[PDB]
Structures are given as C-alpha cells and as structure tokens.
Amino acid sequence: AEYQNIFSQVQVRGPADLGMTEDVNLANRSGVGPFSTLLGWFGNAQLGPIYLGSLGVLSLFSGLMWFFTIGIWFWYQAGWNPAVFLRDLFFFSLEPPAPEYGLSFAAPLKEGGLWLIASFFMFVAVWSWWGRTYLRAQALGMGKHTAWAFLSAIWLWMVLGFIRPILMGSWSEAVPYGIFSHLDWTNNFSLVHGNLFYNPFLGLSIAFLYGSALLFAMHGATILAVSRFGGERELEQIADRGTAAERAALFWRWTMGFNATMEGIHRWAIWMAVLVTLTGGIGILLSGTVVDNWYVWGQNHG
Amino acid sequence: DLASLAIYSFWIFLAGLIYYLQTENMREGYPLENEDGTPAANQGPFPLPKPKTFILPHGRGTLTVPGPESEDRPIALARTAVSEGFPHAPTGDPMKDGVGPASWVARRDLPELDGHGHNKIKPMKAAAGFHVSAGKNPIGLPVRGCDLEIAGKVVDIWVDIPEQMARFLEVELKDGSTRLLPMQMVKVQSNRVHVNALSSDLFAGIPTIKSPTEVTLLEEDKICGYVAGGLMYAAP
Amino acid sequence: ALLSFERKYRVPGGTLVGGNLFDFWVGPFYVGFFGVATFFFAALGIILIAWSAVLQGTWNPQLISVYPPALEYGLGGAPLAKGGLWQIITICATGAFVSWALREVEICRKLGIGYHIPFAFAFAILAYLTLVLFRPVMMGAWGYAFPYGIWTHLDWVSNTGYTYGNFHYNPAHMIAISFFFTNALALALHGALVLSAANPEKGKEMRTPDHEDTFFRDLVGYSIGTLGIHRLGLLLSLSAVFFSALCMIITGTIWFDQWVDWWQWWVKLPWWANIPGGING
Numbered sequence: 001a002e003y004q005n006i007f008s009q010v011q012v013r014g015p016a017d018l019g020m021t022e023d024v025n026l027a028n029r030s031g032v033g034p035f036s037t038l039l040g041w042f043g044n045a046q047l048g049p050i051y052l053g054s055l056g057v058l059s060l061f062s063g064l065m066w067f068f069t070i071g072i073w074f075w076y077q078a079g080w081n082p083a084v085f086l087r088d089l090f091f092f093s094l095e096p097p098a099p100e101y102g103l104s105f106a107a108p109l110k111e112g113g114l115w116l117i118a119s120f121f122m123f124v125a126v127w128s129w130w131g132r133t134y135l136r137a138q139a140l141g142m143g144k145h146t147a148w149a150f151l152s153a154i155w156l157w158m159v160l161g162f163i164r165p166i167l168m169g170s171w172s173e174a175v176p177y178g179i180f181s182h183l184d185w186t187n188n189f190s191l192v193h194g195n196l197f198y199n200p201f202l203g204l205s206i207a208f209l210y211g212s213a214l215l216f217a218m219h220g221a222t223i224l225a226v227s228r229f230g231g232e233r234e235l236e237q238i239a240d241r242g243t244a245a246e247r248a249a250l251f252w253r254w255t256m257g258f259n260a261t262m263e264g265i266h267r268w269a270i271w272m273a274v275l276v277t278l279t280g281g282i283g284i285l286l287s288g289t290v291v292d293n294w295y296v297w298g299q300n301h302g
Numbered sequence: 303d304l305a306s307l308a309i310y311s312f313w314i315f316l317a318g319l320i321y322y323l324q325t326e327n328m329r330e331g332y333p334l335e336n337e338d339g340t341p342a343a344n345q346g347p348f349p350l351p352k353p354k355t356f357i358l359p360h361g362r363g364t365l366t367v368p369g370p371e372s373e374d375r376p377i378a379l380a381r382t383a384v385s386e387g388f389p390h391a392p393t394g395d396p397m398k399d400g401v402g403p404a405s406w407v408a409r410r411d412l413p414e415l416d417g418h419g420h421n422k423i424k425p426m427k428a429a430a431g432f433h434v435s436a437g438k439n440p441i442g443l444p445v446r447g448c449d450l451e452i453a454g455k456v457v458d459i460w461v462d463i464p465e466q467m468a469r470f471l472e473v474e475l476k477d478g479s480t481r482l483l484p485m486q487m488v489k490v491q492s493n494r495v496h497v498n499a500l501s502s503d504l505f506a507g508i509p510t511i512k513s514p515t516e517v518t519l520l521e522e523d524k525i526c527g528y529v530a531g532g533l534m535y536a537a538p
Numbered sequence: 539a540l541l542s543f544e545r546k547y548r549v550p551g552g553t554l555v556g557g558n559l560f561d562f563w564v565g566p567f568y569v570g571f572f573g574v575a576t577f578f579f580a581a582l583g584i585i586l587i588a589w590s591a592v593l594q595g596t597w598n599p600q601l602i603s604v605y606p607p608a609l610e611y612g613l614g615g616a617p618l619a620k621g622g623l624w625q626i627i628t629i630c631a632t633g634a635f636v637s638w639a640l641r642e643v644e645i646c647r648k649l650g651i652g653y654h655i656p657f658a659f660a661f662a663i664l665a666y667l668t669l670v671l672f673r674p675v676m677m678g679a680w681g682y683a684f685p686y687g688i689w690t691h692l693d694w695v696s697n698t699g700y701t702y703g704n705f706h707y708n709p710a711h712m713i714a715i716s717f718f719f720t721n722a723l724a725l726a727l728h729g730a731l732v733l734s735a736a737n738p739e740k741g742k743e744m745r746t747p748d749h750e751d752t753f754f755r756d757l758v759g760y761s762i763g764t765l766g767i768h769r770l771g772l773l774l775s776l777s778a779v780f781f782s783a784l785c786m787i788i789t790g791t792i793w794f795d796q797w798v799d800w801w802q803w804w805v806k807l808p809w810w811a812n813i814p815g816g817i818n819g
C-alpha cells in the first residue's frame with residue numbers, strides 16, 4: 001500500500017497562531033479556541049480566533065432572529081407539544097402573505113406577517129455578512145474576489161424571494177420557510193411554467209453545477225497527485241514554478257490536448273462556480289415575468 | 303423577445319470569457335517549441351497575453367509573465383527516432399541527471415518564507431513549541447527501502463510552521479550523514495518507516511542540503527524529483 | 539508542439555501494455571495502447587450512431603436518439619433497429635471510458651505522480667454504469683436505461699422521476715444534492731481565496747498562505763488549510779456522485795412506491811404516532 005495523503009499520518013502542533021496583523025483592529029479578534037485532533041487528520045487542528053466587529057454582531061444577531069422567528073411559528077403549529085414538534089418537524093412551514101395583500105406589509109401575523117418579519121431579518125443578516133466579507137479582505141490587503149463571488153449566490157437568492165416577487169406583484173410568489181415546503185414549491189414552479197427543462201438557463205446552470213464537480217474533482221486530485229513535490233503551496237508555485245506545476249500541467253496536456261497554469265486553474269474554478277447561480281438567477285427572473293411557458297417559448301423562441 | 307435577447311447575449315459573453323480564460327493560462331510554457339528548442343511554427347489560435355508583474359513579499363523582487371523561459375540546466379537526453387513525437391532516452395543516469403520522472407526545475411535557491419519573513423520549514427528541534435501531537439512519532443524509527451533493507455533511521459521531522467504540518471523526515475545514513483525524505487512518500491508503520499520509491503543503495507544519492515537548518519526551493523525540487531524517479535528507475 | 543519545459547519529461551517507459559510499441563505522442567496527445575483502444579471504440583460508436591440516424595430519418599442533433607430495447611426483450615439481445623444499436627453503442631461507450639482511465643494511469647506512471655485522477659474518474663464511470671447496466675439488470679430489462687439523445691434523455695429523467703412522485707423525497711437524492719451544492723460553494727471559495735492572495739489590492743505585494751488562513755479564521759473562525767481544501771474538494775465531489783448512483787440503485791429495486799410515502803416510518807413511530815395536533819394529526 002502506497003501513501004495517498006488523504007489523511008495525515010502524523011499530526012504536529014505548536015503554539016496558537018494569532019494570525020497576520022495588517023490594518024486589522026486586533027481589539028475585535030477573540031482568543032484562540034481549542035485544537036481539534038479530529039479535524040487535524042484532514043486539515044488544520046486550530047479553531048479560532050474569529051473577528052467580531054460591529055457588522056459581525058449585527059449580522060449574527062439578525063441571523064438568529066430570522067432563525068428564531070421561524071422556530072416559534074413551527075412551535076405554534078406543533079401546539080407547543082415537543083412530541084409533535086419533532087414528528088412533524090419537516091412538515092411545518094412559514095408561508096408568505098396570501099396573493100390578496102400583493103406587495104403590502106399589512107398582512108396579519110398568522111397570515112404572512114411573520115414571513116415578512118423573518119424575511120426582513122434574513123435580508124440584513126445576509127447583506128451585512130456580505131459587507132463583512134469585503135472589509136475582512138480590505139483589512140488584510142487582499143483582492144475582493146470572495147465578495148464578488150458571494151454576490152453571485154446572493155443574486156439567485158435576491159431573485160427567488162425579492163426581485164421576482166415584486167415584478168410579479170405579490171409576496172405570495174416567494175418561497176416559504178419550510179423543509180418539505182420549499183421542495184414542493186420548486187417542483188411546483190417548474191410545472192406552472194411549462195416544465196423548467198425547456199428554460200435554456202436551467203440547462204446552462206446544470207451544466208455548470210456538473211462542471212463544478214468535474215473541475216473540483218479534477219483539481220483536488222491533481223494537487224494531491226503532485227503533493228509529493230509540494231504541489232499544495234500554490235502561491236509560491238505561482239511565483240516560482242516548480243516540478244509540481246510542470247507535471248500537473250503536462251498530465252492534462254498529454255490527456256486532453258491542453259492545460260492550465262497554477263494561477264489560471266483558479267480562474268477557471270471561480271467562474272465555473274460563479275456561473276451556476278449567475279445563469280440560474282436570470283433563468284428564474286424571466287420566469288412568469290417575461291416567459292409564461294417554456295415549452296411554448298421553445299416552440300418558437302419568442 | 304427579451305428572453306431570446308438574454309440568452310444570445312450570454313453566449314457572446316461566454317465566448318469572450320473562454321477567450322480570456324485561455325490566454326490567461328498561457329503565461330507559462332509558451333511560446334511552444336520544436337523538440338530542438340526552436341519556436342514552433344503555429345502557436346495555435348490564441349495570442350500570448352500582455353505581461354503581468356507580481357511583487358514578491360519580502361524584498362524578494364519582481365516576477366513578470368509571460369517572460370523569457372529557459373531550463374537553466376543541461377538536459378541529458380537524446381532523440382530515439384528521426385521524426386517528432388517520440389520518447390527521448392536518458393544518456394546517463396536518469397536519477398543522477400534529473401530527467402523523466404526524476405526531473406527537477408531550477409527554482410530560486412532561497413527558502414520559502416512565512417508571512418513574517420521567517421523560514422517556512424524548519425527541523426522540529428529548532429522550532430520552539432512544536433511537538434508530535436497525534437499519530438506514531440517516527441523519530442528514532444529505522445527506515446526501510448523497497449528492497450526490504452534498512453538504510454537508516456529518522457532523527458527529526460521538518461515542519462511547516464505557519465501551516466503546522468510535517469513535510470520531511472530527516473534520516474541518518476550509515477555513513478553518519480543525513481538526507482531529507484518527503485512526508486508524502488513514506489509509510490509510517492508501528493515499528494518502522496517504509497519507503498517504496500527507493501531501494502537501500504539509493505538513499506546516499508538523495509541530494510544533500512547546504513545549511514542543516516534550512517532548505518531552499520531549489521533543494522526541495524531536486525530531493526522530491528529524485529525519490530519520485532525511483533518509482534520508475536529503482537523498479538528492478 | 540512542446541511546452542517550453544516539456545522535453546525533459548518525454549522519456550520512455552510507464553506503459554501497462556505493449557511495451558514501447560505505442561509509447562509516443564501525436565501533437566500534445568500521448569498515445570498508449572489504450573490511446574488506440576479508445577479511438578477504436580469511439581470511431582465504431584460514432585459510426586453506429588450515424589447509422590442509427592439514417593434508420594430514424596434525421597441528421598438533426600436535437601432529434602437523433604438511440605433507444606434501448608423495449609421491455610418485452612427483458613435482458614436479452616434485440617434487433618438493431620429496436621434496441622440493438624443501443625446495446626452495442628453502450629458497450630463501445632464503456633470500452634472507451636475504461637480505456638481512457640487506463641490511458642491516464644499510463645500517463646501517471648511516466649510522470650511519476652499519484653493515481654488520484656484516474657481514481658476519481660472511476661466514480662463517474664460508475665454512475666454511468668449504474669444507470670445503463672446495474673439498475674437495468676436488477677430490474678430485469680434493458681428497457682429501464684436512458685436513451686442516447688440530447689433532449690430525449692431529459693425526458694427519461696423527467697418521466698423516471700415522476701414515476702415515484704416528487705423525486706425530491708428520495709432521501710439519498712437529498713444527500714446527493716447537498717454535496718453538489720456544497721462542492722460548488724467550496725469551489726467558489728477556494729478559487730476566490732487563492733486569487734485574492736495572488737492578486738492583492740492594487741500595487742500591494744503578493745499575499746501569503748498565512749494571510750489566506752488569517753482571512754478565513756477572521757471570517758468564520760476556522761481555516762481548513764491549503765492541503766485540506768484540496769482533500770475536501772476531491773471528497774465533496776466523489777461523494778456527490780456516490781450518493782447519486784446510490785439514490786438510483788435503490789429506486790425501482792428495493793423501493794418502487796411513492797418516495798414521499800417512505801417518510802411515514804418516522805411520523806408513525808409508536809411514541810408520537812398518535813399524539814393529536816400538528817401537521818400529521
């Protein structure tokens with residue numbers, strides 16, 4: 001048996017790493033947490049520290065509010081009986097206001113009111129966390145790649161529960177907070193729109209979803225294949241190409257006729273991923289607002 | 303209609319994106335060459351990208367790509383056919399010459415530095431606070447070759463301090479000297495360390511390092527290339 | 539024809555079969571015994587498809603479609619026009635995929651790197667085999683496999699899914715989707731991280747892996763590391779496909795009723811099975 005390097009064979013620990021200090025306000029970084037021997041077998045054993053600024057608390061707070069808001073309702077539905085609560089856990093659902101109220105905020109709590117509340121908490125929780133993602137990169141002098149990629153996912157999210165419901169004219173068009181609920185909603189959205197498979201954007205979106213798995217499988221495997229030449233130290237291989245970067249590239253060139261570079265492969269990676277939700281948001285945004293039946297549209301594109 | 307507009311726009315966008323992506327992945331290894339190191343006739347449909355420059359972290363300089371490429375080392379190989387497309391055979395000792403699966407590239411002869419400017423990898427004896435926190439500790443273990451013969455014993459572990467990870471094992475040979483073995487190429491067993499890629503009589507060939515407390519990028523490449531080449535060349 | 543640093547690697551050796559008979563390149567492509575094997579299987583399979591196109595009456599890519607033998611035929615042979623071409627092509631496809639993996643193994647040996655790639659690819663081949671071979675055989679007829687056609691195969695998915703109600707309820711299909719979703723999230727982060735370090739704020743100096751680790755601990759309070767992130771991606775990927783093949787291998791075999799009903803085992807557990815109120819009471 002040859003060593004595969006999927007799990008480390010020897011763990012090595014040293015003093016806690018307080019991390020790089022840049023324009024970072026060290027007053028907002030907590031203290032290091034414990035070391036996990038378990039995680040250590042796969043990756044880093046160190047937990048923490050974490051940086052909690054005003055936005056972090058803001059985000060983290062409203063994040064729980066959203067979560068709790070939905071949860072008291074699920075309990076209201078379970079008749080406060082902890083037995084029922086568990087049995088029908090996947091069945092509960094906080095639905096949006098009836099189509100009657102349109103895009104109003106006058107719906108009574110037991111009729112969509114809580115939904116609006118919860119949605120509002122989720123709105124700031126996500127957007128404040130997005131800002132957090134940007135500032136955290138600025139404080140360390142790094143590019144904003146993570147913030148722009150995260151924006152892509154936010155796009156699909158914004159379309160699903162905000163932008164589309166407004167262009168349609170009612171919060172009833174949005175997604176319900178429930179496990180089995182949002183599953184039915186999905187199946188249902190497709191049926192109502194003439195079978196989503198006829199929507200060219202779902203098709204692209206799928207392509208990239210499958211492509212993301214193809215790529216990461218390819219990438220992760222490659223790097224492990226050349227980790228015997230320290231292939232994982234991607235940054236230095238970018239500044240001073242080593243044999244790891246050369247045989248990695250050559251493996252793919254001899255296999256499919258072309259290759260990437262240590263930096264290039266990551267540009268392929270960020271876009272393959274980002275396009276999943278980018279293409280998907282457009283597809284959904286045009287559903288019901290511009291195209292009513294994809295089967296029909298497909299019959300004569302227009 | 304709008305939907306038709308959207309989807310058509312997208313495909314044009316996607317074509318520009320793939321163009322960008324492909325040219326971006328040509329900043330290394332290009333332009334292509336003939337087996338004799340001469341610029342190849344056709345370079346394909348995509349043009350070389352406009353150069354970009356990296357500012358290395360510790361006064362270590364600048365890097366601009368694409369830029370003049372050149373193996374800054376001799377290649378002991380000779381053609382085996384009269385036409386392009388065939389294997390080139392090693393003229394000497396593939397292991398000693400650093401060709402084929404035993405190849406290494408002329409990386410900077412400096413060590414990699416962590417975020418603060420310190421050597422990224424150090425022997426564990428010189429890294430205060432570090433210790434084996436889990437798994438069999440290899441230190442003091444004898445090392446065996448693919449020929450089932452003992453070639454030495456581990457005397458230390460070189461660690462990556464900023465990533466707290468084991469990267470090499472320092473092994474002492476019968477002649478009293480030591481060599482580095484990449485962690486990813488050894489099998490740590492309950493009562494011994496096994497090394498498949500090499501046979502006992504090859505450990506001495508492993509390239510040696512200048513300073514005993516540091517390794518340079520150039521030395522890592524020669525060491526790793528060497529033991530990986532054993533898979534093919536030590537085979538008998 | 540060669541990358542600036544390529545000649546030194548193009549040495550003899552590594553082949554699994556045929557010694558040095560096929561040990562050579564064509565342009566950038568390596569050609570092992572399996573290089574030839576895949577070409578043979580692919581040419582043939584493309585030929586049979588072209589021939590199946592005529593029997594059908596179209597040369598339109600959106601229309602062409604090779605269907606498996608009708609259920610009547612069970613697991614036996616069938617006339618070329620009615621399921622036979624599909625069976626032969628399936629063999630060729632399988633021959634072409636397995637050969638490609640083996641060719642990758644040979645490329646691995648010449649370069650002296652690990653076998654993780656061919657290994658990962660095997661999982662994809664496995665998913666394919668579950669759909670066109672394993673499930674059909676366990677169900678009793680080649681008629682349960684999917685047709686080879688750009689749209690007709692989506693019809694299969696759609697129909698096969700709805701055959702058990704809303705397929706969303708397949709539990710193994712839920713795990714699978716989670717891994718797919720997660721792998722994409724992870725891929726987006728890995729690519730953005732490395733890029734934001736190699737391309738720091740305008741004019742600033744190239745960041746280090748230390749900064750990468752810092753950024754994540756600052757953000758979520760933990761960093762899996764550079765080696766860990768690649769182990770993770772490989773794992774999320776292979777797991778997504780593993781649960782996919784699995785959710786299908788059980789559909790129509792050990793479970794052939796509505797998937798939504800499968801969930802009663804939980805709601806009807808003795809204890810809460812009778813309490814009044816809630817959604818199920």
Ligand code: BCL
Pocket residue numbers: 202203204206207208210211214584587666669684688689691692695
């Ligand atoms: C996984 C569950 C279903 C399935 C469900 C779906 C669904 C749902 C969708 C697709 C879609 C696609 N499927 Mg499928 N598909 C299945 C099995 C297969 C098999 C196989 C050998 O088993 C193949 C070749 C394909 C191929 C394809 C593509 C034509 C198309 C997706 C583009 C893409 O980016 O893919 C990911 C791969 C990459 C990004 C890598 C690059 C590979 C390229 C794209 C392959 C091109 C193949 C070419 C069109 C066929 C050549 C055949 C000739 C005989 C040589 N599917 C199984 C049975 N498939 C999408 C579509 O738009 O359909 C109209 C779509 O929405």
Ligand code: BCL
Pocket residue numbers: 157160175179180182183186706711712713715716717719720
């Ligand atoms: C894209 C089309 C549909 C959709 C279709 C589906 C389908 C189809 C499936 C899911 C499934 C899931 N969906 Mg969804 N889903 C949508 C939109 C959302 C919205 C929000 C939009 O803004 C969210 C947060 C979710 C969230 C979720 C997860 C709860 C669950 C997948 C696990 C996962 O790996 O997630 C990826 C994210 C991470 C790994 C990071 C965060 C950690 C997550 C939240 C952990 C969840 C654990 C889960 C609650 C555990 C249950 C078991 C316990 C023992 C009770 N969906 C849209 C509207 N969703 C799967 C499922 O199993 O559902 C029951 C499933 O099959």
Ligand code: BCL
Pocket residue numbers: 186187635662663664665666668669694695696697698699700704705706714715718779781782783784785786
């Ligand atoms: C309406 C129908 C049902 C439904 C019915 C099904 C059915 C039926 C199936 C799936 C399957 C899948 N479904 Mg579903 N599914 C639904 C809704 C969803 C939703 C959602 C958000 O609503 C999601 C995320 C998913 C997600 C998924 C995936 C987990 C999984 C497919 C990936 C896979 O197996 O790849 C595996 C990859 C392959 C099979 C490809 C192998 C590639 C081969 C080896 C190489 C080909 C090379 C090519 C020929 C070369 C070309 C060369 C050129 C030079 C390029 N489904 C609805 C509710 N789903 C499938 C599954 O689990 O399959 C096992 C499946 O059969």
Ligand SMILES: CC[C@H]1c2cc3[nH]c4c(c3C)C(=O)[C@H](C(=O)OC)c4c3nc(cc4[nH]c(cc(n2)[C@@H]1C)c(C(C)=O)c4C)[C@@H](C)[C@@H]3CCC(=O)OC/C=C(\C)CCC[C@H](C)CCC[C@H](C)CCCC(C)C
Pocket residue numbers: 059060063064067125126129133146147149150151152153273274275276277719720722723726727757758
């Ligand atoms: C290309 C698009 C893909 C993508 C990308 C993506 N996602 C991202 C990013 C990117 C680039 C981020 O930067 C961001 C991130 O920070 O990741 C680590 C994120 C992120 N993607 C997330 C989820 C997510 N992404 C998904 C998908 C995708 N993300 C796509 C596949 C999905 C699916 C598949 O549905 C989900 C659920 C988030 C985990 C994270 C952004 C976090 C956020 O917005 O947080 C607000 C904060 C809260 C809601 C906090 C409360 C949380 C819990 C309800 C309570 C329990 C935990 C809490 C810690 C308990 C505290 C207890 C106290 C007693 C102490």
Ligand SMILES: CC[C@H]1c2cc3[nH]c4c(c3C)C(=O)[C@H](C(=O)OC)c4c3nc(cc4[nH]c(cc(n2)[C@@H]1C)c(C(C)=O)c4C)[C@@H](C)[C@@H]3CCC(=O)OC/C=C(\C)CCC[C@H](C)CCC[C@H](C)CCCC(C)C
Pocket residue numbers: 126153154156157186187188189190196197201202205206207209276277279280281283284695719
């Ligand atoms: C029966 C239903 C049909 C259907 C419907 C459907 N698919 C869909 C949609 C719908 C309605 C989408 O909206 C979505 C899409 O984008 O479509 C264009 C999608 C899609 N269908 C896909 C695939 C797919 N669909 C399929 C099928 C079908 N889809 C059926 C035919 C199939 C197959 C094999 O049959 C596949 C492979 C994806 C490409 C794409 C869906 C989106 C996706 O993967 O998204 C990941 C990202 C998000 C959900 C991002 C929003 C993220 C938030 C910002 C984070 C949440 C924050 C929160 C704070 C987290 C808290 C976590 C706590 C733990 C802390």
Ligand SMILES: CC[C@H]1c2cc3[nH]c4c(c3C)C(=O)[C@H](C(=O)OC)c4c3nc(cc4[nH]c(cc(n2)[C@@H]1C)c(C(C)=O)c4C)[C@@H](C)[C@@H]3CCC(=O)OC/C=C(\C)CCC[C@H](C)CCC[C@H](C)CCCC(C)C
Pocket residue numbers: 210211213214217218221255256576579580583584627630631634635638642655656658659660661662685686687688691775776777779
């Ligand atoms: C964890 C598994 C993930 C994965 C991994 C993966 N794929 C891989 C690898 C890996 C590690 C490779 O090394 C290999 C590669 O070399 O990629 C560049 C590959 C690869 N993954 C590919 C495709 C692919 N992977 C997919 C998925 C996945 N790949 C998973 C997400 C999908 C999906 C989701 O549908 C597709 C289409 C190929 C591009 C490539 C392998 C190429 C190959 O084997 O080529 C030689 C074979 C031929 C020339 C065959 C042609 C045969 C005949 C012409 C008949 C055709 C029959 C077929 C049934 C017709 C189908 C028609 C459709 C309309 C239905």
Ligand SMILES: COC(C)(C)C/C=C/C(C)=C/C=C/C(C)=C/C=C/C(C)=C\C=C\C=C(C)\C=C\C=C(/C)CC/C=C(\C)CCC=C(C)C
Pocket residue numbers: 067068070071072074116119120122123157158159160161162171175176177178179182
């Ligand atoms: C254990 O018990 C306790 C009480 C402690 C907690 C219990 C809570 C539980 C068990 C919670 C379970 C929650 C679950 C399972 C939630 C699931 C949500 C799911 C599956 C999907 C969500 C989809 C939602 C998306 C599409 C929502 C998007 C929302 C927006 C874009 C915001 C829109 C904002 C609006 C309409 C109003 C705000 C207005 C402005 C602009 C200021």
Ligand SMILES: [Cl-]
Pocket residue numbers: 021
């Ligand atoms: Cl300091």
Ligand SMILES: [Fe+3]
Pocket residue numbers: 219223234266728732768
């Ligand atoms: Fe990487």
